Design an enzyme around this catalytic site. Structure first.
Site, PDB file in Angstrom:
ATOM      1  N   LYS A 148     -14.285   8.499  -4.879  1.00  0.00           N
ATOM      2  CA  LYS A 148     -15.248   8.744  -4.250  1.00  0.00           C
ATOM      3  C   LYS A 148     -16.176  10.273  -4.992  1.00  0.00           C
ATOM      4  CE  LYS A 148     -13.808   6.748  -0.095  1.00  0.00           C
ATOM      5  NZ  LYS A 148     -13.219   6.901   1.271  1.00  0.00           N
ATOM      6  N   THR A 186      -8.162   6.484  -2.723  1.00  0.00           N
ATOM      7  CA  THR A 186      -9.599   6.232  -3.035  1.00  0.00           C
ATOM      8  C   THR A 186     -10.615   7.310  -2.772  1.00  0.00           C
ATOM      9  OG1 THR A 186      -9.840   5.310  -0.740  1.00  0.00           O
ATOM     10  CG2 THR A 186      -9.199   3.642  -2.581  1.00  0.00           C
ATOM     11  N   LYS A 231      -9.012  13.814   4.007  1.00  0.00           N
ATOM     12  CA  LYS A 231      -8.018  12.715   4.111  1.00  0.00           C
ATOM     13  C   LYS A 231      -7.178  13.010   5.446  1.00  0.00           C
ATOM     14  CE  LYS A 231      -6.474  13.912   0.031  1.00  0.00           C
ATOM     15  NZ  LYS A 231      -6.586  12.878  -0.973  1.00  0.00           N
ATOM     16  N   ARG A 232      -6.325  11.805   5.723  1.00  0.00           N
ATOM     17  CA  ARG A 232      -5.601  12.124   6.863  1.00  0.00           C
ATOM     18  C   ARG A 232      -4.310  12.989   6.666  1.00  0.00           C
ATOM     19  NH1 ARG A 232      -5.671   8.018  11.255  1.00  0.00           N
ATOM     20  NH2 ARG A 232      -3.848   9.262  11.968  1.00  0.00           N
ATOM     21  N   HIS A 276       0.797  -1.315  -0.069  1.00  0.00           N
ATOM     22  CA  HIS A 276       0.041   0.074  -0.010  1.00  0.00           C
ATOM     23  C   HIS A 276       0.807   1.372   0.099  1.00  0.00           C
ATOM     24  CE1 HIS A 276      -4.031  -1.895   0.722  1.00  0.00           C
ATOM     25  NE2 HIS A 276      -3.263  -2.715   1.149  1.00  0.00           N
ATOM     26  N   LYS A 296       0.518  14.556   1.590  1.00  0.00           N
ATOM     27  CA  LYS A 296      -0.540  14.844   0.840  1.00  0.00           C
ATOM     28  C   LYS A 296      -0.658  16.204   0.763  1.00  0.00           C
ATOM     29  CE  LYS A 296      -2.795  10.700   3.122  1.00  0.00           C
ATOM     30  NZ  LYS A 296      -3.706  10.128   2.076  1.00  0.00           N
TER      31      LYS A 296
HETATM   32  O1  LIG Z   1      -0.413   2.830   6.347  1.00  0.00           O
HETATM   33  C1  LIG Z   1      -1.209   3.074   5.321  1.00  0.00           C
HETATM   34  N1  LIG Z   1      -2.602   3.640   5.599  1.00  0.00           N
HETATM   35  C2  LIG Z   1      -3.111   3.862   4.252  1.00  0.00           C
HETATM   36  O2  LIG Z   1      -4.452   4.377   4.418  1.00  0.00           O
HETATM   37  N2  LIG Z   1      -2.600   3.695   2.918  1.00  0.00           N
HETATM   38  C3  LIG Z   1      -3.243   3.836   1.969  1.00  0.00           C
HETATM   39  O3  LIG Z   1      -3.752   2.864   1.276  1.00  0.00           O
HETATM   40  C4  LIG Z   1      -4.919   3.135   0.367  1.00  0.00           C
HETATM   41  C5  LIG Z   1      -5.882   1.573  -0.042  1.00  0.00           C
HETATM   42  O4  LIG Z   1      -4.745   0.959  -0.996  1.00  0.00           O
HETATM   43  C6  LIG Z   1      -4.286   3.846  -0.834  1.00  0.00           C
HETATM   44  O5  LIG Z   1      -5.408   4.272  -1.667  1.00  0.00           O
HETATM   45  C7  LIG Z   1      -3.382   4.991  -0.702  1.00  0.00           C
HETATM   46  F1  LIG Z   1      -2.635   5.482  -1.642  1.00  0.00           F
HETATM   47  C8  LIG Z   1      -2.533   4.551   0.600  1.00  0.00           C
HETATM   48  O6  LIG Z   1      -1.983   5.758   1.166  1.00  0.00           O
HETATM   49  C9  LIG Z   1      -1.508   3.042   2.789  1.00  0.00           C
HETATM   50  C10 LIG Z   1      -0.673   2.685   4.133  1.00  0.00           C
HETATM   51  F2  LIG Z   1       0.557   2.265   4.149  1.00  0.00           F
END
Ligand SMILES: O=c1[nH]c(=O)n([C@@H]2O[C@H](CO)[C@@H](O)[C@H](F)[C@H]2O)cc1F
Ligand SMILES: O=c1[nH]c(=O)n([C@@H]2O[C@H](CO)[C@@H](O)[C@H](F)[C@H]2O)cc1F
EC number: 2.4.1.1
Lengths: 812, 812
Positions: B656, B652, B544-545, B353, B550
């Site tokens: 949305k 993601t 987003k976080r 990820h 970001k």
């Molecule tokens: O700790 C993490 N927490 C997180 O939300 N992610 C996210 O995973 C999402 C699902 O694949 C992706 O859409 C994002 F690009 C990614 O930042 C990745 C991490 F490593």
């Protein structure tokens, strides 16, 4: 099947089966292919619970509309046991559910065994609260039991290598279908902080807050459609609690530990901070809830508070209700001291349960200073004003002033919580006639002299629903066949049975029911414990918490005497006995743990001696609790009630045995005195020192050596214990026991030994004549009526609470 | 009311009302006189849950009979949000429940707001797991989600004085009607201990035991009568645990702390022991459950294990599944190493990820040595055998050997969990085309060279049930009016909307739905937060976080530019904007906490400047979570997706917004690239450095001073931040932010500033022409089909799991 269990009507049975299947599907999310007996238990429990709901809602609606005086029973213990069968009995559903489950291919009795005991008490005091709730609902009183929802109740006892081991009683693991969480009625409770003095009185500030979340459990009356509430508080941290981040969330456990576990001490005070927190937690949440309900009923008129509210304190455990009520009235409602005190006294009443000095709550001042600073200040002010009254009544009597003070001086200053309860209550009661007299003559003599009108007696009782109809349906039925069913809520009607003492049919029926109970219990032991007993022997039973004052050790001495006599004359006839002893020891109580080991050690020798055969068996009944009492008590022939005179305040196990067709061997102690008075001394096996005899012996000094020197059979037993006869691998295992008996025995075991053994011979003599044994049994059952908790509660209602009991039915 | 919400038939509505009243009475024990809106919510939830049960039971029966290959999705996070509306949507009950509750005098939307989010995740990774469960059920796959039932999910965020404060998310306080406890399937998990070597292999002995108790939650498919299971494990102490007595019972909390709280880090590795315990806890309990189900299905043939079982690892968090499966097969089932390894590889697949180095799990060897001694030994053996293969493939390449090792050398030895996952999986995938290519080119280049066949791409997706039908019924309806309802489970059908881009009626309807959504959201803000916005402004949204990569900071720079330009020329027309930024910061992440303070500080100046008026507003959206996303996303005009190229693996949230009628301003990063490819670059607002441009800048060295020197408008902003313009009381408050931007900016904020501002001007230009704005919106919605998680899951099923998706209905 049997009449007292009610009707099994076609409509009822059809509906029960339907709802059972609905719950299995929708509630448990199972089908018949994957369901276990536990799933089936839960489906039945939910089905029965559904029948409580309508009545529960309309009972509480009724109290709102009628606005009667409310009774609040405050206790740290509610020893409830199982709920399923009790609920069926009180709703008259037992036969219908038995039929419904039978048609589904299930055995209801097997399902009943799955339910966990709600073991939220230690013994007598906790079980009294439970019987009281049953009677208050049966008598139509607007009553609420208030306590703590412990996540872990009294520990499960395992016996390993003859020793007690403790395991956590995780009673909520599979869920509790009976309770309803009420998070909407959550209330804050304050701890620590400091007191600030303003222009407008004291303020308690900078406190730590713990939330009290209530869970409500229905309490059904016997076939009167009344359903009262037991409300138990659970501790919750506030959401900003401690708020690096992870640790702050984990530290919530510190707040929530308040309701985690029941302190497992019986008749013994342990001055630990966590216990004090539990006591204030229940009191603070309960009082807020009471006041809220009072304000919402029908600017605020607190003069009428005692007309609408009674608070009963079960022992001193909830004694902080007195200064807490003063705190709320003075600091928050802004009443003057004198008015608040008048309201407090007229509201509160206190029940004492023991005279043993080690059981009395005496809290160190330094603990109250840190934890509850405002309460300590209120207690000092109560004390000052009380002592001013004493000084005016008994001028110059300086020693009386120190004796009566709520504050005890010494190494550590302590608060005497019993003194606080007497000062702040309009009624103080003991729990049997002899106990109530001892209070006025000894420990509370000074208080009785100042305020004689406060002191009352309320002899204890037990509920005949759980302790006859539920556990002994066979006996309930043969009684009902002759005198009808009215006795179940009017136990005095059992006197009618006196006219059947010469009835040959009744005699045979009474003895038949006992044999069946004994056979069933003998089978229970083999199935669950692989222990093998002779059902034709006399079942000699002592079940109760393990304590030196209760003298399980005196029983042990008798058992060894019987064994030694058999070994001396092997070919002589003796009446066969199965001696059963059970009960838990507090984990920290070394001597009680040693007594359990002694009992199993005696069993190890006696049960394997080929010369003894099946003439004598000694069994320790593991994990004694409410559900086990319901099994063993109906099976008993002889009830051992052998505490040193003046030490057992009342006893209630004694009453359970009397109701269930056992004869009693006992000292003139607690309620034994009133039991013998009711039945006739000739129908009881009384032995030993009376209270006055114990007093005389104390005056000249108790010397155990004298008895050892003069009684050869006693000497033999002590030599056997000392030399390692009962512990060959560890010869000195029982040294502590021998030392205590010989040099430091507060309870004078040797002094009652001779008379006890002789009295036991008279028991064996009567048992040889089945017909006369049974006739004496009938005389006991017939005169057990006084010991119904319905009688007890009616007396509290009329003489303390100022309310009238009602046997009137609410609409269904 | 609206078509896509289903039928409200007379029979259905009558039955729903009946069951609602039954639950209020029997389940909640309330009548209409005392019931609160929360009681009404619960009565509705239980009523809807009842409809799931039959389908849930027969789905699981179907899988037993058919015995298909089972898919196990292992994740430490399931970001589920609320369940009530989602369940109604998938069962076609929404209109019927709306009617039923309306006839009872209740507003269903008001009841929906009472439900707590199940916030068991941090952000993208956790929400992906949730969308995946929905798609797997909709595609008729025999799938199970396995995770941890955290007592506390992601913290609730409060903003106090412009700062983030954290509060405990006590989501279970009022109960969870959706879950079913299954204490009967409780399993032991082992920790600590030591390894013993016998004649018959290794033995793991002297361990501490924690119990894993499962809770099952139903996962309904979209109108196909399939109901799958999400099984979450809760930690429980055994009853003999620590078994002075009181403390032993209190110490149970130590064991049970494993499932207490979700670690609140997003894209950041924290090597704490408790987190490692959580990771093993889920893996050990899950694998036992999988093996049990495999043995009970239809001596034990493990060769067929991979034919009946697939395990998907969501990131490296459950990577211990690999050595745990080896442990079970070798130590317990007694398979030889080579056979066990073949089974393990064919069973497991791994999804990556992120490429950010700080997010990668590298566990210290000393931690694994103490906690999981047998797993460390298995990991060393895996490493030895893997490196032997590398050495054979690339003889003499000693540096490759150190680069590829699962064991990292240095100050502290660590295990690289990503290396373990690649070695032990038959498939490794990235989550967008660009990300998957970056993996093969950079961080996993060596592994790709050794085993090219393992590496795949599976572009992320979102479920169109929650993210269109549920949150935006107005849009769903106008689409359905034209192309029918089939697109809800076949999103590619949205392409048919391209033939309406010139349709004047459709254009008006699309714009009308957006206005209504904006009005509703503008109202939500006033009601719940007393914040006042102009609904005619462009809604510019970044949710987003909070993270440096970001680039919420780049957004802040643009906001200040707009403010400065207005102050420079107050009487010039500008397109009005409401700039909304929301998201949580990890409690330990200082810079992210400072960014939140900056945003609120900018709002403090901008929102109160009389010269600005209602032309510019800056709002921080507090407590961003799933339920808030469902409200704000349908209301958005502009979606900010502005991460530095190469840093956001997929995203993601971007998908949305596209589905819900917002245009996107973004870098060519993650899935943005594929979104622009689908819609056409002319229908997207793309700006900034590409990955190759970032690489070039890194080669010569990024010098932020150059940009400061050459861009006067940028210089002005930095001077304002430094001098205390946005914090007059604390002039140096933002020093850390300025220092980072000027000297230590890993994400090159200044380098994209000029192109970002110019691109934002083009956005404002298009918004001035409502008709052309809306036509571009239609081109986005029409081409959003590829981003359905149904497409994603169908690709996993065919290319990794070896199973075929099914749109076939199970019997109702
Ligand atoms: O700790 C993490 N927490 C997180 O939300 N992610 C996210 O995973 C999402 C699902 O694949 C992706 O859409 C994002 F690009 C990614 O930042 C990745 C991490 F490593
Ligand atoms: O801590 C105690 N725990 C307990 O069971 N009791 C008991 O209370 C019972 C109910 O009144 C009486 O029948 C007994 F006499 C008394 O020992 C007294 C205690 F002080």
């Amino acid at each position: 099947q049997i009449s007292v269990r009610g009707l099994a009507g076609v409509e009822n049975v059809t509906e029960l089966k339907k709802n059972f299947n609905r719950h299995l599907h929708f509630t448990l999310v199972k089908d018949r292919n994957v369901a276990t007996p536990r799933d089936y238990y839960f489906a039945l429990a939910h089905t029965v619970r559904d029948h409580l709901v309508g009545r529960w809602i309309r009972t509480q609606q009724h109290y709102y509309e009628k606005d009667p005086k409310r009774i609040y029973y405050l206790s740290l213990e509610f020893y409830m046991g199982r709920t399923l069968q009790n609920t069926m009995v009180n709703l008259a559903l037992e036969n219908a559910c038995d039929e419904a489950t039978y048609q589904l291919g299930l055995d209801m009795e097997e399902l009943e065994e799955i339910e966990e005991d709600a073991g939220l008490g230690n013994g007598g005091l906790g079980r009294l609260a439970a019987c009281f709730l049953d009677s208050m609902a049966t008598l139509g009183l607007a009553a609420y039991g208030y306590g703590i929802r412990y996540e872990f109740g009294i520990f499960n006892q395992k016996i390993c290598g003859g020793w007690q081991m403790e395991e956590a009683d995780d009673w909520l693991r599979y869920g509790n279908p009976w309770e309803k969480a009420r998070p909407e009625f959550t209330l804050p409770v304050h701890f620590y902080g400091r007191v600030e003095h303003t222009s407008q009185g004291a303020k308690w500030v900078d406190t730590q807050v713990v939330l009290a979340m209530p869970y409500d459990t229905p309490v059904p009356g016997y076939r009167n459609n009344v359903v009262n509430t037991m409300r138990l508080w659970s501790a919750k941290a506030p959401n900003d609690f401690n708020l690096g981040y992870i640790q702050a969330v984990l530290d919530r456990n510190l707040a929530e530990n308040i309701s985690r576990v029941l302190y497992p001490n019986d008749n013994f005070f342990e001055g630990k901070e966590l216990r004090l927190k539990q006591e204030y937690f229940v009191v603070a949440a309960t009082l807020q809830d009471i006041i809220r309900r009072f304000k919402s009923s029908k600017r605020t008129n607190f003069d009428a508070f005692p007309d609408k509210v009674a608070i009963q304190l079960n022992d001193t455990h909830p004694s902080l209700a007195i200064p807490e009520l003063m705190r709320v009235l003075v600091d928050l409602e802004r009443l003057d001291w004198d008015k608040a005190w008048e309201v407090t006294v007229k509201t509160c009443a206190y029940t004492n349960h023991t005279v043993l000095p080690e059981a009395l709550e005496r809290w160190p001042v330094h603990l109250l200073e840190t934890l509850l600073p405002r309460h300590l200040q209120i207690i000092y002010e109560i004390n000052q004003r009380f002592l001013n009254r004493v000084a005016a009544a008994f001028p110059g009597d300086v020693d009386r002033l120190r004796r009566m003070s709520l504050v005890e001086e010494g190494a550590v200053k302590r608060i005497n919580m019993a003194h606080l309860c007497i000062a702040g209550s309009h009624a103080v009661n003991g729990v049997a006639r002899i106990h109530s007299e001892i209070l006025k003559k000894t420990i509370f003599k000074d208080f009785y002299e100042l305020e004689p009108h406060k002191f009352q007696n309320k002899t204890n009782g037990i509920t005949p629903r759980r302790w006859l109809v539920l556990c002994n349906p066979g006996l309930a039925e043969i009684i009902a066949e002759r005198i009808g069913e009215e006795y179940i809520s009017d136990l005095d009607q059992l006197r009618k049975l006196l006219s059947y003492v010469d009835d040959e049919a009744f005699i045979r029926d009474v003895a038949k029911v006992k044999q069946e109970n004994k056979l069933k219990f003998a089978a229970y032991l083999e199935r669950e414990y692989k222990v093998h007993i002779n059902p034709n022997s006399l079942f000699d039973v002592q079940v109760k918490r393990i304590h030196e004052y209760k003298r399980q050790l005196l029983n042990c001495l008798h058992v060894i005497t019987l064994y030694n006599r058999i070994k001396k004359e092997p070919n002589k006839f003796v009446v066969p006995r199965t001696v059963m002893i059970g009960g838990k020891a507090a984990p920290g109580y070394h001597m009680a743990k040693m007594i359990i080991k002694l009992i199993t050690a005696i069993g190890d020798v006696v049960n394997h001696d080929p010369v003894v055969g099946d003439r004598l068996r000694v069994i320790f009944l593991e994990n004694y609790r409410v559900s086990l009492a319901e099994k063993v008590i109906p099976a008993a022939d002889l009830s051992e009630q052998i505490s040193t005179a003046g030490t057992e305040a009342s006893g209630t196990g004694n009453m359970k045995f009397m109701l269930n067709g056992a004869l009693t061997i006992g000292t003139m102690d607690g309620a034994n005195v009133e039991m013998a008075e009711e039945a006739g001394e000739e129908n009881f096996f009384i032995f030993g020192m009376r209270v006055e005899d114990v007093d005389r012996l104390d005056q000249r000094g108790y010397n155990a050596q004298e008895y050892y020197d003069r009684i050869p059979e006693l000497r033999q037993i002590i030599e056997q214990l000392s030399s390692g006869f009962f512990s060959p691998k560890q010869p000195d295992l029982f040294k502590d026991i021998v030392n205590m008996l010989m040099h430091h025995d507060r309870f004078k075991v040797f002094a009652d030994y001779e008379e006890y053994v002789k009295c036991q011979e008279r028991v064996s003599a009567l048992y040889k004549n089945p017909r006369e044994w049974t006739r004496m049994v009938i005389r006991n059952i017939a005169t057990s009526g006084k010991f119904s908790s319905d009688r007890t509660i009616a007396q509290y209602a009329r003489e303390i609470w100022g309310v009238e009991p009602s046997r009137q039915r609410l609409p269904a």
